[PDB]
Symmetry: C2
Subunit: 114 residues, 2 copies
């Protein structure tokens, strides 16, 4: 995962079956008061999806080509965020990322890093 | 306009005629891989510029409902980033944002903060 592969803002992602997972705790300044900065959420969805992508091809370096995020609901501060990832297609993976506290959904195209 | 309205990561955005515009300087640690800029940070700056752009155009607090982003090229580190917004339609603005050093095209649907 990010420990098997280095100088980014990449969170630990893991396998939970065919799906992947991450957990994150926003520091108090990571605000939007009482709510989580919407750009962090994209930061986390983005590194998880790329990580998820690396795993799937492993079963290799990947980069985001496209990232689409629906913000479904305000994300409360002071709560652990959990990220779930679904592999929809496997040099390029397609991943669906769900972030809960559901607050935000991502559809992500990762390709092999050129 | 963020000095017009406070505890986010919102960047100084301004009118550029009919377009809006902003500039940003990544900190040395905001890397992706060496030599380039973290994608989360890039997605973060489109979001706050796009929302900033939204509030000015409607004139009010706006939030992102959807943000779609295509990563057109790697973003070099140590150079000032320029963000320009296109207002595509105006309690809901649709905005097109371009970050340069063109490195990424973002599409935003912003709605009034509920």
């Amino acid at each position: 995962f990010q420990d098997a592969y280095s100088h980014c803002y990449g969170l630990k992602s893991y396998w939970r079956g065919e799906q992947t997972i991450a957990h994150f705790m926003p520091k108090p300044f990571h605000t939007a008061p009482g709510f989580v900065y919407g750009g962090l959420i994209a930061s986390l969805i983005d590194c998880h999806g790329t990580g998820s992508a690396s795993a799937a091809a492993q079963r290799p370096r990947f980069v985001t080509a496209a990232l689409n995020i629906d913000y479904l609901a305000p994300t409360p501060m002071g709560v652990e965020l959990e990220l779930v990832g679904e592999i929809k297609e496997v040099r390029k993976v397609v991943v669906e990322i769900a972030l809960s506290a559901l607050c935000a959904r991502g559809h992500m195209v990762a390709v092999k890093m050129p």
